[PDB]
Design a protein around this ligand. Structure first.
Ligand code: SF4
Ligand SMILES: [Zn+2]
Lengths: 208, 760, 309
């Protein structure tokens, strides 16, 4: 229910994204998706310098235009390693989004570091037991609404930080609290299912 | 890549070749087998130049005798630079393929303005000033005196070339204008004189139309050209206009005043030198009476004011004794100038034939044709014998002498038009005489009769029969190469109806219509709001464009257009026009929409090329018919009708369609380049007018897009942009629009290539 | 100071946190603040118009954003403003003159040329101001048995199992459906008892309303203490791992601040619970976290001492 007015500012958005992604570790991939409805944008400074800075920062930028192809956006996507697309219709937009859901292939410059992660259990405290210590969730503390005093939940093995949502990286020690199903949820990408051979029914003399 | 074209090996510098390129190579080889002139039509952006250069190099390697030297004629300096770069890349590919540097020498020729290094002549803003200063610093009489006096003015660049540059010719290779300047600076020589000296040695010589088509400049190149040389003309769709302009003479009242002043100064100088030394006049008289061959053939450096326009037969005859005396010829020139001014005093426009004007001059001024025939020779001798350095101030006298010589010898195909009032401002006394030439073929007549063959190609060659009539010759081959595309890169559309269903037309009666202007403004606004940044709009005339822009601003529609995309409008001044074009290109490369509004006769339509992101949308506002009020155009149309049975309306339509195709045909650079073509006029729907479009463009002109509206055009543009902006792979072009090495060997592919091209 | 004060006013919780950390001498203000620390469009002239109200109202709405855009596009306007406002003329008078001047109302060859030149100059000024790896794993069986630990997979006895496999194969070879043998009244009663409330299957039961046992003010104080301790521990763990000598001093200061906070705020809060004798062990989580941090720091100090041995 917002109001659509003015003109897009690609330079400011890219600068803000780079500032946010400046502190991110190198091994983590930096991916940018841009929805460009208008064909013209206003940049307070030269965008090519920002393009060079993004290239040095190893950030992938993909642009899906709506009206037509933009030469500047195409060059930016090519230099950043991303893909530029143009929307044909709603079905084409959905297909492009589904294609962009899959992780992009890792480039040569992609780092390979052994990151350490913790997998806490769902610690649930019973009021019958004397060891029931209700505590507000750290994530729920961030909201203006009063956090719910939960009897149990997930406690960080590294600093005993309490979180009620997973997979959420621990804010205190920076540890990424994940679960075994979460890790296995991307295993299908590791072993993609190859397309089966298509032989017409008439030419196939076998089981019906 | 190696190509076998009718048993001839071609070293293609790219890994793939278009089928149209193979057909062009085959047809060019067939034409070369006949040693005759030929006309071929090839779509722009198809790499025709690369194929032509490769085939010429293959022919030279196989048979140097058949093509002793290649001649390339172009339009602008950037074209020469691009040709030099492409030929250098091809030579590098040849050297890599063969492992050795071939003994191949290529050279580009330009004026002294683009080849001067002297610091004093550098800041000059005009080539004529540069030429005059160079002549003053490199005069033959000045050089001889400077030999005994170093303090005298001189140019070391030419002197060192004369002393050192003549013995050692340039090594085999290809050099650019900047490369030539750098070599001259390194060696202390002038690249202009060194290039002129090395023309006879260069296997390929590339220059512009003016350096050879102009008879005044023809001998500066043709003297070192043999009969077996092959001449190439690219984008020569307006060669007739260039020849007419070269053969046309314009005189004004200010020109007459300057001529009178320079004649008075010349008479004073003659009197002064005669008082100082009368022997020079006697020596000049002896030279003239004994023969003009002695002076012309012994000083090749005095070619500053060469006049090779007259046929070689007239050169043998000497100047009549009545005007051999310097004072007699000065009085003759004074009487001629007075008669010309008196004739120009007429308060109405006078149309005359050269024979009638010559007869009138003979009756009044007692001037026979024979003494006036040698006007240029006597003027050249007088200017050479007086050691005149600042010849720039003497230009009007030379122009008048050349005009008189043209009248005295050339009669058929010329018209003298005397207009004392400007067409734009008849209230202003502007007495102007036009010696308009209606026979451009004469300017190309010796070229057909001297060289082995002439190559003519252009992207706007819709009628294949008018050019043989225009140039008065019979080309051996007249073939148009149809363009085959795996992906439709062009969407030409015609919009003769506005939003309010107003009949869109560009006739001068309807040019002042407010409704047409408002419809054009709405169309431009929608195009800016829809089509990408690259927008170019070609109008019909400068005044019409200015009125349309003013009406758009007053209505306020142009304000929203500026809100969508930045607006750049060219002016008459080319200096600020270049800045505007640079700003437009920068904005298009900065992601902000830039819109250009030019005229079909402006500089943009002449020598400006658009990249894929620059030629996204080209819109022609009506058929660019030439302003008929020019009596020169009417006289040319009458002469063409009386000499070639060509209707004036047909010629005007052909010229307008050629201009439109030139404006729009530069928006495509290849298969990967796609652009939008819009023709906002109902007149384009006419069968005669529509049929005068290039075949590679007319074929893609779908009848479903004929005479659409603004909304329909916008929808079609959206569909075309969305379809053609999808990612594409060059592998898809294989077998359909692109041929690999293996695909060439297929006989079915060869049959398809043969079927692609058609001869007429 | 003025800049620092406004930040506290905007967030009263932070101001309360600032008071609890600095005024109570838990941390210094210096260390407190150490951790805490437009394109140009061509429509600025055409779209911006003198707004006419219902009854002779010139609603200028002269926002500074439009004025800055005009100055960037037209330095002459800025020069006139500097040389006239507010001495030669007022700002409103200058704007009225600009509206009434030919500069704004540009609206015949001379007029068309002037309009074209103005548009080209505007476009040029706007443009000028715009700048100012293939993977091949070795042991795929790790995915077959992933994070699942070694299970109790036991292989049976020798060939006799096949004979047992025969027995069932002979047992169910001649099978007939049965109805009475499926369920019995005693089995049904046992199943009901297991499924009855308070049974083995019905694990546990009702619980206690912890919300009413802890006052809402105590809940808010606990939330504030949780936020403060979490921020302090995040700052502590941010230094870890300690790779530079400065991180050692920073972690020592962080531990001192944590101890000061625990003494000054946590302990009086503890009695606040203890005076109310609340049975909820809210402080127990805080104590566990603080002890974990202290043990981690002590262990790292022991490692550092051992590395120097
Ligand atoms: S000789 Fe060459 S360098 Fe010297 S003035 Fe002439 S063109 Fe320029
Ligand atoms: Zn943690």
């Amino acid at each position: 229910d917002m109001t659509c007015h003015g003109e897009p500012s690609l330079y400011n958005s890219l600068s803000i994204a780079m500032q946010t992604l400046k502190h991110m570790p190198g091994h983590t991939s930096r991916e940018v998706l841009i929805i460009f409805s208008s064909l013209t944008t206003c940049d307070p400074s030269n965008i090519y310098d920002l393009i060079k800075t993004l290239k040095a920062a190893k950030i992938r930028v993909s642009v899906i235009g709506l009206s037509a192809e933009v030469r500047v956006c195409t060059v930016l996507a090519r230099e950043t390693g991303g893909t530029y697309h143009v929307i044909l219709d709603e079905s084409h937009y959905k297909e492009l989004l589904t294609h962009h859901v899959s992780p992009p292939p890792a480039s040569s410059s992609s780092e390979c570091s052994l990151i350490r992660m913790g997998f806490p259990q769902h610690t649930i405290a019973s009021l019958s037991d004397q060891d029931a210590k209700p505590s507000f969730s750290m994530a729920h503390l961030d909201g203006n609404t009063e956090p719910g005093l939960t009897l149990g939940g997930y406690f960080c093995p590294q600093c005993r930080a309490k979180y009620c949502e997973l997979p959420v990286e621990c804010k205190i020690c920076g540890l990424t609290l994940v679960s075994a199903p979460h890790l296995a949820r991307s295993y299908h990408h590791l072993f993609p299912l190859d397309a089966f051979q298509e032989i017409p029914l008439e030419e196939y003399n076998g089981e019906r | 890549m190696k190509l076998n074209v009718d048993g001839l090996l071609v070293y293609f510098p790219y890994d793939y070749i278009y089928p149209e390129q193979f057909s062009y190579m085959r047809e060019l080889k067939r034409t070369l087998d006949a040693k005759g002139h030929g006309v071929l039509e090839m779509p722009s952006g198809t790499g025709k130049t690369v194929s032509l250069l490769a085939l010429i190099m293959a022919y030279q390697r196989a048979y140097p005798l058949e093509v002793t030297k290649l001649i390339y004629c172009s339009r602008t300096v950037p074209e020469i630079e691009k040709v030099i770069e492409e030929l250098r890349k091809l030579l590098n590919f040849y050297e890599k393929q063969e492992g050795e540097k071939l003994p191949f020498l290529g050279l580009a020729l330009s004026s002294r303005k683009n080849l001067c290094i002297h610091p004093e002549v550098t800041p000059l803003r005009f080539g004529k000033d540069v030429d005059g200063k160079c002549h003053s610093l490199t005069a033959s009489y000045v050089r001889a005196q400077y030999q005994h006096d170093t303090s005298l003015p001189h140019c070391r660049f030419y002197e060192e070339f004369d002393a050192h540059g003549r013995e050692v010719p340039l090594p085999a290779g290809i050099y650019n204008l900047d490369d030539l300047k750098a070599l001259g600076r390194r060696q202390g020589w002038c690249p202009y004189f060194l290039a002129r000296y090395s023309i006879l040695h260069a296997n390929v010589v590339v220059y512009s139309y003016h350096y050879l088509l102009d008879p005044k400049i023809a001998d500066l190149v043709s003297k070192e050209l043999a009969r077996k040389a092959v001449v190439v003309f690219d984008e020569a769709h307006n060669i007739d206009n260039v020849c007419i302009d070269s053969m046309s003479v314009n005189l004004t009242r200010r020109t007459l005043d300057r001529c009178q002043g320079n004649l008075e100064t010349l008479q004073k100088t003659v009197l002064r030198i005669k008082e100082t030394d009368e022997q020079r006049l006697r020596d000049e008289y002896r030279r003239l009476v004994e023969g003009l061959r002695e002076a012309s053939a012994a000083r090749e450096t005095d070619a500053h004011l060469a006049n090779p326009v007259l046929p070689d037969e007239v050169l043998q005859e000497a100047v009549p004794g009545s005007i051999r005396t310097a004072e007699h010829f000065l009085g003759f020139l004074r009487r001629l100038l007075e008669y010309v001014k008196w004739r120009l005093r007429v308060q109405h426009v006078v149309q005359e034939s050269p024979p009638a004007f010559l007869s009138g001059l003979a009756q009044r001024v007692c001037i026979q044709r024979k003494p006036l025939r040698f006007c240029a020779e006597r003027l050249r001798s007088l200017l050479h014998t007086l050691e005149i350095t600042d010849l720039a101030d003497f230009s009007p006298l030379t122009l008048l002498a050349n005009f008189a010589t043209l009248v005295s010898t050339y009669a058929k195909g010329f018209t003298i038009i005397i207009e004392p009032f400007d067409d734009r401002t008849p209230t202003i006394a502007n007495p102007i005489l036009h010696f308009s030439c209606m026979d451009a073929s004469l300017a190309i007549k010796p070229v057909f009769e001297r060289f082995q063959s002439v190559i003519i190609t252009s992207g706007t060659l819709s009628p294949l029969d008018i050019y043989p009539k225009i140039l008065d010759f019979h080309p051996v081959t007249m073939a148009t190469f149809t363009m085959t595309l795996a992906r439709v890169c062009l969407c030409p559309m015609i919009i003769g109806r506005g939003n309010d269903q107003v009949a869109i037309s560009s006739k001068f009666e309807t040019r002042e219509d407010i409704a047409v202007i408002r419809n054009y403004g709405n169309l431009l606004l929608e195009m800016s709001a829809v089509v990408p940044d690259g927008i170019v709009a070609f109008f019909t005339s400068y005044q019409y464009m200015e009125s349309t822009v003013a009406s758009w601003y007053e209505q306020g529609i142009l304000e929203n257009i500026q809100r969508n995309k930045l607006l750049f409008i060219e002016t008459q001044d080319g200096a600020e026009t270049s800045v505007a074009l640079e700003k437009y290109q920068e904005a298009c490369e900065n992601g902000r929409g830039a819109i250009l509004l030019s005229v079909a006769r402006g500089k943009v339509s002449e020598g400006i090329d658009f990249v894929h992101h620059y030629g996204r949308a080209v819109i022609m506002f009506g058929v660019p018919y030439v302003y008929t009020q020019s009596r020169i155009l009417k006289a040319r149309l009458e002469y063409l009708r009386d000499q070639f049975q060509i209707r004036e309306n047909d010629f005007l339509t052909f010229d307008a369609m050629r201009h439109a195709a030139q404006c729009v045909g530069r928006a495509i650079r290849g298969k990967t380049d796609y652009g939008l073509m819009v023709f906002a006029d109902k007149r384009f729907a006419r069968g005669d007018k529509r049929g005068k479009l290039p075949r590679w463009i007319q074929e893609h002109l779908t009848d479903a897009n004929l005479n659409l509206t603004v909304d329909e055009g916008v929808q079609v543009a959206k569909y075309f942009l969305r379809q053609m902006a999808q990612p594409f792979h060059r592998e898809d072009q294989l077998g359909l629009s692109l041929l690999s090495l293996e695909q060439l060997e297929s006989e079915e592919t060869l049959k398809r290539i043969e079927q692609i091209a058609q001869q007429l | 100071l003025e800049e620092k004060n406004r930040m506290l006013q905007e967030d009263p919780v932070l101001f309360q946190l600032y008071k609890d950390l600095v005024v109570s001498q838990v941390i210094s203000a210096e260390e407190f603040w150490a951790n805490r620390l437009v394109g140009i469009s061509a429509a600025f002239l055409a779209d911006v118009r003198p707004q006419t109200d219902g009854c002779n109202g010139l609603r200028y709405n002269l926002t500074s954003d439009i004025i800055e855009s005009i100055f960037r596009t037209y330095p002459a306007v800025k020069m006139k403003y500097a040389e006239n406002v507010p001495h030669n003329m007022t700002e409103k008078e200058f704007w009225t003159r600009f509206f009434q001047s030919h500069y704004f109302h540009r609206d015949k060859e001379n007029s068309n040329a002037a309009i074209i030149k103005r548009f080209n100059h505007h476009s040029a000024m706007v443009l000028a101001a715009g700048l100012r790896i293939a993977l091949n794993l070795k042991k795929s069986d790790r995915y077959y048995h992933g994070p699942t630990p070694i299970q109790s997979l036991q292989y049976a006895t020798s060939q006799d199992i096949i004979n047992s496999f025969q027995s069932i194969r002979q047992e169910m070879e001649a099978y007939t459906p049965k109805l009475t043998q499926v369920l019995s009244s005693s089995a049904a009663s046992s199943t009901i008892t297991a499924l009855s409330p308070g049974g083995a299957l019905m694990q546990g039961g009702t619980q206690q309303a912890i919300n009413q046992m802890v006052p809402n003010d105590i809940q808010s104080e606990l939330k504030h203490l949780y936020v403060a301790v979490g921020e302090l521990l995040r700052h502590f763990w941010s230094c870890f791992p300690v790779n530079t000598p400065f991180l050692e001093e920073k972690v020592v200061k962080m531990k001192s601040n944590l101890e000061r906070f625990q003494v000054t705020k946590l302990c009086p809060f503890q009695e606040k619970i203890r005076r109310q004798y609340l049975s909820t062990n809210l402080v127990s989580h805080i104590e566990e976290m603080l002890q974990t941090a202290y043990n981690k720091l002590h262990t790292w100090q022991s490692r550092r001492l051992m590395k120097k041995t």
